[PDB]
């Protein structure tokens, strides 16, 4: 019940499906690659989750370190203020509860250090865990800071916005046929070194056995200097005449109603503000190829300055066209 498989959906996104793949694995370096690029919703969570985790973990470590040295006994049980004089043997001055260890870990890692919970020189394990906690805190801090700067570097690029018309046409220009779509642009910055390429996708057997299933020929776009470049501010019409060398040369008015054609168009180039290459692609199955229809004039010189009227981006009007073939039209004068 499904329609013929399309090579490229209207929103680019070549929908091929590679199977029989020699699946390597992950290498555990994939996680960091994913982490550097997340939607901002998450990178205000993994920040909080990392900081809060590390804090709590080192808090429990301080709790056990103090607990096993007998400090908590000396604080809790012995006299509160007067009946007891500290033996100075304590490991971490004035941390007599878990919450105290939390308010010590925060101090020891966010570099606050209020100074009501000092580090004495008795318990060597305490100094060891202090070195370890400080090192871990710095490593996490640098990684998170670099992640935040990376996700502030990519605030310029948003999305490829280059708009091709819905359905193409085929008309008459200078006594010869053609085939036209309509490219366009939206945002402020122009394109730089823009290029256009037209490929026709077909299943073309050969007289020598080979039958390439999905094979893609390239066809030229009309231009008086044979250069595939284009400089666009208002929408252009990148025509591509048909001739004996061209593959569409055997197309027909009625056969196109049931035919296997696939004219993908790709457009490449950079943008001045971003300074990043980019490209956009689309395809035109036979069902959305009209005939005789030509595109409409869109630019009208108003009183002050030129105006491009997007109101009729893809509107088409019928005009004279012959129902014969390209080879019929070019076969003979009388033809």
């Amino acid at each position: 019940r499904l329609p013929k498989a399309r090579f490229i959906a209207k929103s680019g996104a070549c929908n091929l499906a590679h199977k029989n793949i020699r699946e390597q694995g992950r290498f555990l370096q994939d996680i960091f690659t994913t982490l550097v690029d997340l939607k901002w919703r998450h990178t205000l969570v993994i920040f909080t989750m990392s900081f809060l985790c590390s804090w709590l973990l080192f808090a429990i470590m301080w709790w056990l370190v103090a607990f096993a040295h007998g400090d908590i006994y000396a604080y809790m049980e012995k006299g509160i203020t007067e009946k007891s004089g500290l033996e100075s043997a304590v490991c971490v001055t004035n941390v007599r509860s878990f919450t105290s260890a939390f308010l010590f870990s925060i101090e020891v890692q966010v570099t606050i250090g209020f100074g009501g919970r000092m580090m004495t020189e008795e318990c060597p394990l305490a100094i060891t865990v202090l070195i370890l906690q400080n090192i871990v805190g710095l490593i996490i801090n640098a990684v998170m800071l670099g992640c935040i700067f990376m996700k502030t570097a990519q605030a310029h690029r948003r999305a490829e916005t280059l708009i091709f018309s819905r359905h193409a046409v085929i008309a008459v220009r200078n006594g010869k046929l053609c085939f036209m779509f309509r490219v366009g642009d939206l945002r402020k910055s122009m394109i730089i070194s823009a290029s256009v390429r037209i490929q026709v996708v077909k299943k073309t057997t050969t007289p020598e056995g080979e039958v390439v299933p999905i094979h893609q020929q390239d066809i030229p776009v009309d231009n008086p200097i044979e250069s595939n470049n284009i400089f666009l501010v208002a929408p252009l019409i990148i025509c591509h005449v048909i001739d004996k060398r061209s593959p569409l040369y055997d197309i027909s008015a009625t056969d196109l109603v049931n035919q296997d054609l696939e004219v993908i168009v790709i457009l490449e180039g950079v943008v001045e503000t971003t300074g990043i290459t980019t490209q956009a692609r689309t395809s035109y199955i036979a069902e959305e190829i009209q005939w005789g229809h030509r595109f409409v004039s869109i630019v009208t010189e108003e009183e002050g300055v030129y105006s491009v009227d997007y109101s009729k981006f893809g509107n088409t009007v019928r005009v004279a066209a012959p129902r014969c073939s390209a080879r019929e039209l070019d076969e003979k004068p009388s033809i």
Binding site: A17, H18, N20, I21, R22, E23, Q24, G25, R26, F27, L28, D30, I31, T33, T34, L35, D37, L38, H42, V45, I46, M49, S50, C53, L56, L57, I60, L64, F67, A68, G70, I72, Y73, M76, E77, F98
Partner: protein
């Protein structure tokens, strides 16, 4: 007055007589592995593998089976059951005591959530093709096992009655952890640090 993980009784934290021969310090030590596994396995599962290598359409539930998978689910469900029993015994005992004495059941609850996270981690790391990470899990068990042992043996030195509910209930956890450790070891050969074939075969939908 607030929570007292060692009992709000003076000298219940007096560690002068012995270093680890205390009722609550053993409980806290047993607690530590969960508060490590959760905080080393929360974000790793949170930030899943999102890089692009070959394509997006992966074989759904590709490696549906895993080496030794048959025991895992049932064993971990039994672990959840025994954690439930432990928390129940602690909570029923709690009302008789004076203070909160969180040492009775806080480790049990932390282990409950840790075991659930372990199941989730196993399923989310096995179904997708990423066993090189699974090695981390093994460490947990070792750690946990040791702490559990560090409890039980001491009880024998205290010689709690065999007919007592608490000792009998807590006994089986060590054996369950040992069986889980063996299960984790048995799939050690295909994916590990070294000297293994590490053969790669895709599995059909």
């Amino acid at each position: 007055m607030s929570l007292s993980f060692c009992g709000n009784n003076i000298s219940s934290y007096n560690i002068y007589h012995g270093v680890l021969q205390n009722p609550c310090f053993v409980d806290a030590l047993n607690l530590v592995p969960h508060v490590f596994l959760l905080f080393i396995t929360f974000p790793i599962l949170f930030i899943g593998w999102g890089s692009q290598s070959s394509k997006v359409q992966i074989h759904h539930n590709t490696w549906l089976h895993f080496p030794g998978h048959n025991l895992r689910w049932i064993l971990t469900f039994a672990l959840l059951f025994v954690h439930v029993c432990e928390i129940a015994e602690g909570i029923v005992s709690d009302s008789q005591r004076a203070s909160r004495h969180l040492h009775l059941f806080m480790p049990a609850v932390m282990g409950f959530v840790a075991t659930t996270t372990s199941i989730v981690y196993y399923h989310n790391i096995e179904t997708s093709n990423f066993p090189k990470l699974l090695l981390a899990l093994f460490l947990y068990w070792v750690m946990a096992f040791i702490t559990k042992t560090i409890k039980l043996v001491k009880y024998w030195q205290l010689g709690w009655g065999m007919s007592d509910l608490r000792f009998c209930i807590t006994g089986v956890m060590v054996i369950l952890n040992g069986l889980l450790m063996a299960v984790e070891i048995n799939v050690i050969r295909v994916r590990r640090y070294v000297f293994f074939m590490n053969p790669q075969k895709v599995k059909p939908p």
